Amino acid sequence: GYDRHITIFSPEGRLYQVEYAFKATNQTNINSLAVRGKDCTVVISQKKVPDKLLDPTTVSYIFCISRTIGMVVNGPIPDARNAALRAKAEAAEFRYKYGYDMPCDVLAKRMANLSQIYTQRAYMRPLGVILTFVSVDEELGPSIYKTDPAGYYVGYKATATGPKQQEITTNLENHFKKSKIDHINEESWEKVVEFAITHMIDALGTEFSKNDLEVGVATKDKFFTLSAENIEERLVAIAEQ
Amino acid sequence: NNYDGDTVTFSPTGRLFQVEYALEAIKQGSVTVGLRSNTHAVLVALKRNADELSSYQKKIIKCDEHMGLSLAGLAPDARVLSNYLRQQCNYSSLVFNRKLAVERAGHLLCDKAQKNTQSYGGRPYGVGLLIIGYDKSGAHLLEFQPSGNVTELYGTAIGARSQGAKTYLERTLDTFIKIDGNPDELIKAGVEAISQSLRDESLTVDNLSIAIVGKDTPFTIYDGEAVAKYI
Amino acid sequence: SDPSSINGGIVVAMTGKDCVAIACDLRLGSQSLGVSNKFEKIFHYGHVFLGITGLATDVTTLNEMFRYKTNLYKLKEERAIEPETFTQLVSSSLYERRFGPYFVGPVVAGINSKSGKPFIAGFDLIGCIDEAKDFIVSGTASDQLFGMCESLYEPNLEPEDLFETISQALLNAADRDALSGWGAVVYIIKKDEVVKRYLKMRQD
Amino acid sequence: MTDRYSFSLTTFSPSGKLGQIDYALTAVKQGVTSLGIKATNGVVIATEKKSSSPLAMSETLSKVSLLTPDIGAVYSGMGPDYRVLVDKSRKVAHTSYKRIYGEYPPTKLLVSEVAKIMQEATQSGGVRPFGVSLLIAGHDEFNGFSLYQVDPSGSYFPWKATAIGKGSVAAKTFLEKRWNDELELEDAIHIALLTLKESVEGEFNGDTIELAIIGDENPDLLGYTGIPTDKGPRFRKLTSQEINDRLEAL
Amino acid sequence: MDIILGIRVQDSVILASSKAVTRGISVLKDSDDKTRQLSPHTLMSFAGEAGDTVQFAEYIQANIQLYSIREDYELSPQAVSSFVRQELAKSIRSRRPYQVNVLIGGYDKKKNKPELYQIDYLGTKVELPYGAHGYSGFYTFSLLDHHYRPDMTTEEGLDLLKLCVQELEKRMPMDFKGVIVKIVDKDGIRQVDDF
Amino acid sequence: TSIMAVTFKDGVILGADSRTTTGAYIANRVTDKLTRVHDKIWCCRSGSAADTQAIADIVQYHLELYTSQYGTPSTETAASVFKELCYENKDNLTAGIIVAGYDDKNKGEVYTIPLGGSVHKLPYAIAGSGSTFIYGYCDKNFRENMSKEETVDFIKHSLSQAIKWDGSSGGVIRMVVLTAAGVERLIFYPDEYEQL
Amino acid sequence: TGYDLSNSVFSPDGRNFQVEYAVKAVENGTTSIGIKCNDGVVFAVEKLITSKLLVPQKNVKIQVVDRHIGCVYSGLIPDGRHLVNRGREEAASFKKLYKTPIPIPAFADRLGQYVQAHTLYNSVRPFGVSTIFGGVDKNGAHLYMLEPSGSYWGYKGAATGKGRQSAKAELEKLVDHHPEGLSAREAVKQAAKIIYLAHEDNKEKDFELEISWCSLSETNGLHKFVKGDLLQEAIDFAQKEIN
Amino acid sequence: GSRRYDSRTTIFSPEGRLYQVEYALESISHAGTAIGIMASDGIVLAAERKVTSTLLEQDTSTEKLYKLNDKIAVAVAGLTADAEILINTARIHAQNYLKTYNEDIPVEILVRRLSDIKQGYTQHGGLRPFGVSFIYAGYDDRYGYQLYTSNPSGNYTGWKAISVGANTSAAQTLLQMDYKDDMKVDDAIELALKTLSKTTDSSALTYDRLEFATIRKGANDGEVYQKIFKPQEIKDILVKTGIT
Amino acid sequence: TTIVGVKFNNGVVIAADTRSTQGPIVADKNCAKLHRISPKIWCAGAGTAADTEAVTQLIGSNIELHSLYTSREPRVVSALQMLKQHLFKYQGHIGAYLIVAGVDPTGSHLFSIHAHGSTDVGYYLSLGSGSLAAMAVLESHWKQDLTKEEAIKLASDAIQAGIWNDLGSGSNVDVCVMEIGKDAEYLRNYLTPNVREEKQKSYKFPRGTTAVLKESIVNICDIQEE
Ligand SMILES: [Mg+2]
Ligand SMILES: [Mg+2]
Ligand SMILES: [Mg+2]
Ligand SMILES: [Mg+2]
Ligand SMILES: [Mg+2]
Ligand SMILES: [Mg+2]
Ligand SMILES: [Mg+2]
């Protein structure tokens, strides 16, 4: 039964350790969601601080990889930070070697290649995380690229990740079946964030306070995360409509 | 059981069996006692022969002028660890013109042992050590276990039936700690402590090993005729 | 002292109508001392011709190296290497020794077996390709060769006129160089026959 | 750390089977169908863009890849394994050929290098075989047009036409009926589309099919003018629109 | 060291090598044999830098003897000379090069021909009817150019050699203490012990 | 080369000429010697153009990676990274670098890193071949806590004199102003500064 | 099955059992705590007195990193020492390159990444310690706790070892009954109490209390051991509360 | 750690056999039959391709017969990818020898080096052996025309006639019967094809399922030529020897 | 050698003379010095000719691989950054001096790079032994907002100044024009101001003039069949 323990093929051509790494991805019981505006890319994630002894400002699964690229992770925090440190090193090295900022899709490919290696080389385990990279690319515009433990990656109009990803996904598909466009037709990122939160609320059937969410926003030339108070202002505008 | 094939494996209750098996080799070793006052520190060790044609295995090793140890378990592992100690004492003198604090020596041994408990291909050391020394903060006694645990003590014993001596020293603590400026009395008390671990055999002139270090006393080993005075 | 003029020697190549020629002297010396009058400096790998002047040990070494590489090339590709491709291979191989170079002046000559186009090229010791249409020269009498070739050469000579031109260019250049001469060979190269002619010349 | 798996993970079993290679071929069998057809004046390679979710932008996932200006590749099996092989194949076309000879390698030799890489993953320490079969199409001056299949073992074979993956047995049969030595490239494209329709479940259009050709030199894709002898890449990827144009006369 | 000469006649190769060994101010020896038998029908004479000459020659000899045992076959003189050349070419770009010049005289039993190869320390190889290293050629080549014929006998070769050594003894400033002469032919290698 | 950096009440200003020479030939007369290693940490370069560009690019890399992990670096930290490169590679480098940056806690700061790779925190710094001619002038005219406009004038008058006397210095005077307000590039042409 | 025999193997539920077994070794160790206060942090630990022969005050468990960070841990003591040695190398190299002493969040990730790395391969074993650490930097006080999986978060208060449940509950009370702050001096006393309260679950042996702290006002932002009078005082405060 | 997953490819069985070598030989026994026959005036190599398809491009295909240099060729039986690794190594060795000695490599020396490489994989390194058996056909001026085989153990032997791959027992018996020392190349050709015709698992033997080659002195005056047969030329020789 | 680069409205132009020398001797009268890093990134080199070619090919190769990997068209800053880090590493021992010009999705660019690894930006540049003659012309006639036609004229005039006044430069003018949103046009032998005049006399020899010892047919074919 040792084809179960290391990344070699089972008799049906499967990699069980990769499949079990996909299962670890939902250990945190968190859902996230990414959407594109005209000028921006928004990523939101549930924030759960179950212990009262925690400093909630340090509890986060959103990372600022470079000045332009943000990354949200679905999976255990140690593997998430391992991926985050690596992506930061890769993006900085890219800029040094090639003289321009690493595109979101290129970083996604690079991290997807690293993941592929762990599925082929026996001594390295796969990381039990799914990585969603966001930016406003200078050539391609608003961008979402997502990587998984199989080393698969692809670009997205919008996407969702976590235990309830299917509900959020179908909710998003239905909106785009309606609107018939690739993106949220909205000028300000504030309104794209409001769309994102609204559609998560409907799809999950739950209500959010300012401490139940985490929001990252990508614009031309910077990616940033919102404070609890910026999110509150978002929640307030949603309620009043 | 399924978890004792190497040092790199925890049991389901969080134990490291290879380390515990290394601890077991010490329990089989011949008894050795250590104790100290405020001025001197003494090692007493019962040496074990193979038969009546054979010599008695030496148990006490000098590390520096102000430091040395006794062993119980795998003797070649003691030779490796004591050699490492000699080097570290030596490094401290050559580079810093400073005698290595007995406490630092304990920390260095702990870290050396630990590396062999966390990586593949290694094995834990299979020896326990009692380290005495006199440094800038007085007399010291350390107990080293191959799990990497090092402990500073007034007195102790390790090896087969050390428990007897260990209780004796626990009773006598308040008396032997005050034996300042009288080396012979401190040894006597150590010889008395080690006698509580004897069954069948008794202390003879090629059986007994004593070492002492203190205020104005370099680490020195007494064997043979030189222990007659104490039997 | 200068490694590229210890042994002496010259090579010249020329293009004409549906043909190329490549010629060389036969001298090998140790400075003033003439050692051998049979040291040929032109080699061929299939239908591609390579002349090499300079330090003779490196001449020998490079011939053995390109024989090696063109033989493996043929086994893998299942066809003989062409002049344009070989030229790039020579350039690459020389530059790979950028900081400990072979002291040579190679010259490539051949006809592309597909297009029928005549081809020549020259290199410096470190791989720089000189791709002249008319003629390429190399060796210790290269200045003299540039002089002869520049005045004697005209385009589109027939094989047997080209022979006379390149022969006279080599001969009279060699006679004004102390370290060149002692015999000469001339290859006339057409798409399916190659002729090799040894010239009669003064032996001082 | 240090990689301490310095022993083979693929080994012969008592019956002479190399287990991991067979299991790699099984993974290829589950893969989406891809095929190639050789014509007198070109080669066509095609496959289905099976998108995982409709929110995925499937044009950002390239199943057919340029390896050199005159050589392209498609696959069946594990996509991520394919993606890294393409990166390595592109690099080896330069390091072990273009930097030496100043020209791109002929199809068979690049295939040979890819095959070697895949063979080594079948014998080297601490690795599993690649779980993909490749179809590599290309043109070069002295060999003309060619089509090769490369398998997990590193074995490669030249084909007139073939298919790999899911519905390969049926597709190969379909190709045996229609292939002849007088096909022009448009005829081969038409057959490729017909063949591919059988293994495709739902939507069958320019946005769900990926198709490329090795054909005529495209000087309009070169990016510069003024060197008569440089005439442009023979590899071209058909647009969504070009595919749909040919799906009417189908 | 100093003078080494070789001449290939009809059916044999003759190698002549000086006997003196000089350490600066004194002649340490006047009977030194500057040659090694590489195989039963191949002989190598050598001259160049102290220590390196003998180290190189013995290293070559060891390698050829190893080949002979492994294959139970004697390499042709041409093959031996190419091996030797490669080693010297390899050495010239080394950290510290062998400064050694050699002559290889062999009888090829397959082609039934004597063969003489001249190789200098750079790895410059040439096959010759007669050859020398250093300044030896400057004094002897004009005599060899005059008298040499490809159909000479062994005795005629030796006489032409005496004439060469006599010219060297007349015009060369160094006293090289005569030469040791060896002949390589179809029956192997022998020394001419009166010269 | 003439380069300088001056702290003032609202932050720091860097200044430089625009000439780079190959012997007596002016290879570039509009060089930019003021280089960005972080948003509000800039440096002036002197010595080997190859060395200082290489170092600057490496420091920009280190600080970009620092920022990703630990947030905005201090000016002191930037100088420390420069120093490490200059000190450990002193045998192979000819670099004289002035580092100037703005913090909100620390305000404007200036660090000079001369040839040997030592570091010196100063209220202002001058360097390059042309700096020798303005040691007297700068010492007499520099005050602490000048206004933006006084500081622009001090730098303009100083580099004007350096340019006048040093043949290796010349062209336009470039400046970079670093404050809480942001980052402002200034340029002054020969006709303005020559007649001061 | 057999998924639990090798580090870095995912089980079919997506778990690394060897890491979970490492936690068992931690849960079997002595109790250690950390309390974040207004301008600093306090660390305390229970040292079991195995015998009268242990020299009191002489087997120190709390460890300093650089000059501004304290670390305490429960589980396998040598694993904790190994982790602190690595921490010291990481702090030294940071200060070497960047001049400034390592920020606490930066330091936390350095330990985090190192501990996480020991869950990637079967050739190493996970760390058998949970580590509570922290100190004062230029952005204030920080308290972290780090598990064998490499997981860590910032805390208001934290506890690990055999008496972790008791101590947590005590920590939860302090957080609720002081929503505006707790002084460094208060926190020292409270730390003593909570250890004394947590010692219930290790009652067979009596113990020695050990405390340290870094406070911007009380210690100038440097890590110091609570010794002498101030220690005795906090011992008294604790003794009065268990009656 | 990693020891657990180590198959130990290089150990003796209790009987003193190398498991992996035995199992590699078992693999090879399912490969297409290859035959080599030596005459006084040349050598024939004939090999059967493993079942074809009508869409396989034959005229550009090479699965069995490989040129090592101008005087030496090999027939392959086993894993083709493994064979190509070894073939390229042998090609390089041949050129190294030519570069060093300025003489073409003697057939045995090339065969010994390749066999020594195969041997190494059975004694050290913990890697699986190459699943390949070779038949070497070549010429040199010492021993003239020579045939050798090598297998995954790295043992090699010389032959007048030999087969590898499928049905070697049957093939060897047939060659043992009809082979004669004074035999000429054109007879050896006929013998090889007849032997494959009888041992094949196919219904009949046709041009599209064969690779064929000869090494002949049949080249103007004392020199050797290799001839890898085109598909049309195999079709002609099948007719000429009356098999189709 | 004379080489120049000139920025204009919607792009950049580079030009070079065509003489390559061996000391004081002209080896090639019509050398092509304008090399391609990528389709729309071209460069020209002075200094050690093998180094400029080698370094151009190496970075051109890595640029192509980078472009394939990123699915983006190559940038001039990438060519620049890779060249300067390669050259800096070798401490000036690779004697490559280049003007690099190109257009990419980011715009039009013009850079010089020096053998030790320093780089410079500008609107007009020159390099080589004729660089001072060329720069005299560029400094006399260059203005902001040149049209494509004016830039080709200015650049070729700058090369001409090198051709006539620098002994190191000669023969013809080659030009390459890179306009934004268009294919780069490589204009080989854009100017031809130096045709060799016809000689006074034919030096064609009567056949049989040369004395010959031996003729043989060389076997260029492989081993014959049968
Ligand atoms: Mg793995
Ligand atoms: Mg002459
Ligand atoms: Mg003369
Ligand atoms: Mg002469
Ligand atoms: Mg010579
Ligand atoms: Mg000036
Ligand atoms: Mg430098």
Side-chain angles (χ1 to χ4, degrees), chain A residues 4-5 17 20 23-24 52-55 58 77-79 81-82 85 123-126, chain G residues 1-3 8 10-12 14 113 116 119 121 149 151-157 172 176:
Chain A
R4 301 275 161 147
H5 296 187
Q17 283 297 304
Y20 303 162
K23 251 171 247 167
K52 307 200 287 166
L53 292 181
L54 286 164
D55 183 346
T58 69
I77 194 64
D79 285 14
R81 287 171 175 155
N82 176 118
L85 181 62
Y123 89 105
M124 290 260 40
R125 75 163 168 82
Chain G
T1 54
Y3 293 99
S8 85
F10 286 106
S11 63
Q113 300 287 358
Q116 191 272 164
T119 73
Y121 318 102
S149 68
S151 183
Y152 70 83
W153 305 109
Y155 286 79
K156 285 155 172 171
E172 304 207 17
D176 286 323

Coordinates of all heavy atoms in Angstrom, one line a residue, chain A residues 4-5 17 20 23-24 52-55 58 77-79 81-82 85 123-126, chain G residues 1-3 8 10-12 14 113 116 119 121 149 151-157 172 176:
Chain A
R4 N 0.1 4.8 -1.8 CA -0.8 5.7 -1.1 C 0.0 6.8 -0.3 O -0.5 7.9 0.0 CB -1.6 5.0 -0.1 CG -2.5 3.9 -0.7 CD -3.8 4.5 -1.2 NE -4.5 3.6 -2.1 CZ -5.8 3.4 -2.3 NH1 -6.6 4.1 -1.5 NH2 -6.2 2.6 -3.2
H5 N 1.3 6.5 0.0 CA 2.1 7.3 0.9 C 3.0 8.3 0.2 O 3.2 9.4 0.7 CB 3.0 6.4 1.8 CG 2.1 5.5 2.7 ND1 2.7 4.7 3.6 CD2 0.8 5.3 2.8 CE1 1.8 4.0 4.3 NE2 0.6 4.4 3.8
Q17 N -1.7 11.0 -2.8 CA -1.1 12.1 -1.9 C -1.5 13.5 -2.4 O -1.7 14.4 -1.6 CB 0.4 12.0 -1.8 CG 0.9 10.9 -0.9 CD 0.4 11.1 0.6 OE1 0.7 12.2 1.1 NE2 -0.3 10.2 1.1
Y20 N -5.3 13.8 -1.3 CA -5.4 14.0 0.1 C -4.9 15.4 0.4 O -5.3 16.0 1.5 CB -4.6 13.0 0.9 CG -5.0 11.5 0.7 CD1 -4.2 10.5 1.0 CD2 -6.3 11.2 0.1 CE1 -4.6 9.2 0.8 CE2 -6.6 9.9 -0.1 CZ -5.8 8.9 0.2 OH -6.2 7.6 0.0
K23 N -7.8 17.7 0.1 CA -8.7 17.6 1.3 C -8.2 18.5 2.5 O -9.0 19.1 3.1 CB -8.8 16.1 1.8 CG -10.1 15.5 1.5 CD -10.2 14.0 1.7 CE -10.3 13.2 0.4 NZ -10.1 11.8 0.6
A24 N -6.9 18.5 2.7 CA -6.3 19.4 3.7 C -6.6 20.9 3.4 O -6.7 21.7 4.3 CB -4.8 19.2 3.7
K52 N -10.7 33.7 22.0 CA -10.8 35.1 22.5 C -9.4 35.6 22.9 O -9.2 36.8 23.0 CB -11.7 35.2 23.7 CG -13.1 34.6 23.4 CD -14.2 35.2 24.3 CE -14.0 34.6 25.7 NZ -14.8 35.4 26.7
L53 N -8.5 34.6 23.1 CA -7.1 35.0 23.5 C -6.2 35.4 22.3 O -5.1 35.9 22.5 CB -6.4 33.8 24.2 CG -7.0 33.5 25.6 CD1 -6.3 32.3 26.2 CD2 -6.9 34.7 26.5
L54 N -6.7 35.2 21.1 CA -6.0 35.6 19.9 C -6.0 37.1 19.6 O -7.0 37.8 20.0 CB -6.6 34.9 18.6 CG -6.3 33.4 18.5 CD1 -7.3 32.7 17.5 CD2 -4.9 33.2 18.1
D55 N -4.9 37.6 19.0 CA -4.9 38.9 18.5 C -5.5 38.8 17.1 O -4.8 38.3 16.2 CB -3.5 39.5 18.5 CG -3.4 40.9 18.0 OD1 -4.4 41.4 17.4 OD2 -2.3 41.6 18.2
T58 N -3.6 39.7 13.6 CA -2.6 38.7 13.1 C -3.2 37.5 12.4 O -2.5 36.7 11.8 CB -1.7 38.2 14.2 OG1 -2.4 37.4 15.1 CG2 -1.1 39.4 15.0
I77 N -2.4 27.3 7.7 CA -1.6 28.6 7.7 C -0.1 28.3 7.5 O 0.6 29.1 6.9 CB -1.9 29.4 9.0 CG1 -1.2 30.8 8.8 CG2 -1.3 28.8 10.2 CD1 -1.9 31.7 7.7
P78 N 0.5 27.2 8.0 CA 1.9 27.0 7.8 C 2.3 26.8 6.3 O 3.2 27.4 5.8 CB 2.2 25.7 8.6 CG 1.0 25.5 9.5 CD -0.1 26.0 8.7
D79 N 1.5 26.0 5.6 CA 1.7 25.8 4.2 C 1.4 27.0 3.4 O 2.0 27.3 2.4 CB 0.8 24.6 3.7 CG 1.4 23.2 4.1 OD1 2.3 23.2 5.0 OD2 0.9 22.2 3.5
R81 N 1.9 30.2 4.5 CA 3.0 31.1 4.7 C 4.2 30.6 3.9 O 5.0 31.4 3.5 CB 3.3 31.3 6.1 CG 2.2 32.1 6.8 CD 2.4 32.1 8.4 NE 1.5 33.0 9.0 CZ 1.0 32.8 10.3 NH1 1.4 31.8 11.0 NH2 0.1 33.7 10.7
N82 N 4.4 29.3 3.8 CA 5.5 28.7 3.0 C 5.3 29.2 1.5 O 6.3 29.6 0.9 CB 5.4 27.2 3.1 CG 6.5 26.5 2.2 OD1 7.4 25.8 2.7 ND2 6.3 26.6 0.9
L85 N 5.9 33.1 1.3 CA 7.3 33.5 1.3 C 8.0 33.2 0.0 O 8.7 34.1 -0.5 CB 8.1 32.8 2.5 CG 9.6 33.1 2.6 CD1 9.8 34.6 3.0 CD2 10.2 32.2 3.7
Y123 N 10.5 12.9 -2.5 CA 11.0 13.4 -1.2 C 10.3 14.6 -0.7 O 10.3 14.9 0.5 CB 12.5 13.6 -1.2 CG 13.0 14.9 -1.7 CD1 13.5 15.8 -0.8 CD2 13.0 15.3 -3.0 CE1 14.0 17.1 -1.2 CE2 13.5 16.5 -3.4 CZ 14.0 17.4 -2.5 OH 14.4 18.6 -2.9
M124 N 9.7 15.3 -1.7 CA 8.9 16.5 -1.3 C 7.4 16.2 -1.3 O 6.9 15.6 -2.2 CB 9.1 17.6 -2.4 CG 10.5 18.2 -2.4 SD 10.6 19.8 -1.6 CE 9.6 19.7 -0.1
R125 N 6.7 16.6 -0.2 CA 5.2 16.4 -0.2 C 4.6 17.6 -0.9 O 5.1 18.7 -0.9 CB 4.7 16.3 1.3 CG 4.7 17.6 2.1 CD 3.8 17.4 3.3 NE 3.9 18.5 4.3 CZ 3.3 19.6 4.3 NH1 2.5 19.9 3.3 NH2 3.4 20.5 5.3
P126 N 3.3 17.4 -1.4 CA 2.6 18.6 -1.9 C 2.2 19.5 -0.7 O 2.1 19.0 0.4 CB 1.3 17.9 -2.5 CG 1.6 16.5 -2.7 CD 2.6 16.1 -1.6
Chain G
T1 N -3.8 1.7 5.5 CA -3.3 2.3 6.7 C -1.7 2.4 6.7 O -1.1 2.0 5.6 CB -3.8 1.6 8.0 OG1 -3.5 0.2 7.9 CG2 -5.3 1.9 8.2
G2 N -1.1 2.7 7.8 CA 0.3 3.0 7.8 C 0.7 4.4 7.5 O 1.8 4.7 7.3
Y3 N -0.4 5.3 7.4 CA -0.2 6.7 7.1 C 0.5 7.5 8.2 O 1.2 8.5 8.0 CB -1.5 7.3 6.8 CG -2.2 6.8 5.6 CD1 -3.2 5.9 5.7 CD2 -1.9 7.3 4.3 CE1 -3.9 5.4 4.5 CE2 -2.5 6.9 3.2 CZ -3.5 5.9 3.3 OH -4.1 5.5 2.1
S8 N 5.2 13.8 6.9 CA 4.9 14.4 5.6 C 4.0 13.7 4.7 O 3.6 14.1 3.6 CB 6.2 14.8 4.9 OG 6.7 13.6 4.1
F10 N 0.3 12.7 3.9 CA -1.1 13.0 4.1 C -1.9 11.7 4.3 O -1.8 10.8 3.5 CB -1.7 13.8 2.9 CG -1.3 15.2 2.8 CD1 -0.4 15.6 1.8 CD2 -1.8 16.2 3.7 CE1 0.0 16.9 1.7 CE2 -1.4 17.5 3.6 CZ -0.5 17.9 2.6
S11 N -2.7 11.7 5.4 CA -3.7 10.6 5.6 C -4.9 10.9 4.6 O -5.0 12.0 4.0 CB -4.2 10.6 7.0 OG -4.9 11.9 7.3
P12 N -5.8 9.9 4.5 CA -6.9 10.1 3.6 C -7.9 11.2 4.0 O -8.7 11.7 3.2 CB -7.7 8.8 3.6 CG -6.6 7.8 4.0 CD -5.8 8.5 5.0
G14 N -6.6 14.1 5.1 CA -5.7 15.3 4.8 C -4.9 15.7 6.0 O -4.6 16.9 6.1
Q113 N 8.6 29.2 9.6 CA 9.1 28.6 8.4 C 10.0 27.4 8.7 O 9.9 26.4 8.0 CB 9.8 29.6 7.5 CG 8.9 30.8 7.1 CD 7.9 30.5 6.0 OE1 7.8 29.3 5.6 NE2 7.1 31.5 5.6
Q116 N 7.8 24.6 10.2 CA 7.0 24.1 9.0 C 7.9 23.2 8.1 O 7.4 22.2 7.6 CB 6.4 25.2 8.3 CG 5.3 24.8 7.2 CD 5.9 24.4 5.8 OE1 5.1 23.8 5.1 NE2 7.1 24.8 5.5
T119 N 8.0 19.5 8.6 CA 6.9 18.7 8.3 C 6.8 18.3 6.8 O 5.8 17.8 6.3 CB 5.6 19.4 8.7 OG1 5.3 20.5 7.8 CG2 5.6 19.9 10.1
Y121 N 9.3 16.6 5.0 CA 10.1 15.4 4.6 C 10.0 14.3 5.6 O 9.8 14.5 6.8 CB 11.6 15.8 4.5 CG 11.9 17.2 3.8 CD1 12.1 18.3 4.6 CD2 11.8 17.3 2.4 CE1 12.4 19.5 4.0 CE2 12.0 18.5 1.8 CZ 12.3 19.6 2.6 OH 12.5 20.8 2.0
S149 N 3.2 22.0 14.0 CA 2.8 22.0 12.6 C 3.5 23.2 11.9 O 3.5 23.3 10.7 CB 1.3 22.1 12.4 OG 0.8 23.4 12.9
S151 N 2.3 26.2 12.7 CA 1.2 27.2 12.9 C 1.5 28.1 14.0 O 1.9 27.7 15.1 CB -0.1 26.5 13.1 OG -1.2 27.4 13.2
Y152 N 1.3 29.4 13.8 CA 1.4 30.4 14.9 C 0.4 31.6 14.7 O 0.1 31.9 13.5 CB 2.9 30.9 15.0 CG 3.3 31.8 13.8 CD1 3.0 33.2 13.8 CD2 4.0 31.3 12.8 CE1 3.4 34.0 12.7 CE2 4.5 32.1 11.7 CZ 4.1 33.4 11.7 OH 4.5 34.2 10.7
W153 N 0.0 32.2 15.8 CA -0.8 33.4 15.7 C -0.3 34.4 16.8 O 0.5 33.9 17.7 CB -2.2 33.1 16.0 CG -2.8 32.1 15.0 CD1 -3.2 30.8 15.3 CD2 -3.1 32.3 13.6 NE1 -3.7 30.2 14.2 CE2 -3.7 31.1 13.2 CE3 -3.0 33.3 12.7 CZ2 -4.1 30.9 11.8 CZ3 -3.3 33.2 11.4 CH2 -3.9 32.0 11.0
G154 N -0.7 35.6 16.7 CA -0.5 36.6 17.8 C -1.5 36.4 18.9 O -2.7 36.1 18.6
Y155 N -1.2 36.5 20.2 CA -2.1 36.3 21.3 C -2.1 37.5 22.3 O -1.2 38.3 22.4 CB -1.7 35.1 22.0 CG -2.0 33.8 21.3 CD1 -1.2 33.3 20.3 CD2 -3.1 33.0 21.7 CE1 -1.5 32.1 19.6 CE2 -3.4 31.8 21.0 CZ -2.6 31.4 20.0 OH -2.9 30.2 19.3
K156 N -3.3 37.6 23.0 CA -3.4 38.4 24.2 C -2.8 37.8 25.4 O -2.1 38.4 26.2 CB -4.9 38.7 24.4 CG -5.5 39.7 23.4 CD -7.0 39.6 23.3 CE -7.6 40.7 22.4 NZ -9.0 40.4 22.1
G157 N -3.1 36.5 25.5 CA -2.5 35.6 26.5 C -2.4 34.2 25.9 O -3.2 33.9 25.0
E172 N -8.6 33.9 29.9 CA -9.9 34.4 29.4 C -10.5 35.4 30.4 O -11.1 36.4 29.9 CB -10.8 33.3 29.1 CG -10.3 32.2 28.1 CD -11.4 31.5 27.3 OE1 -12.5 32.1 27.2 OE2 -11.1 30.5 26.7
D176 N -11.3 39.6 29.8 CA -12.7 40.1 30.0 C -12.7 41.2 31.1 O -13.4 42.2 30.9 CB -13.7 39.0 30.3 CG -14.0 38.2 29.1 OD1 -14.1 38.7 28.0 OD2 -14.2 36.9 29.2

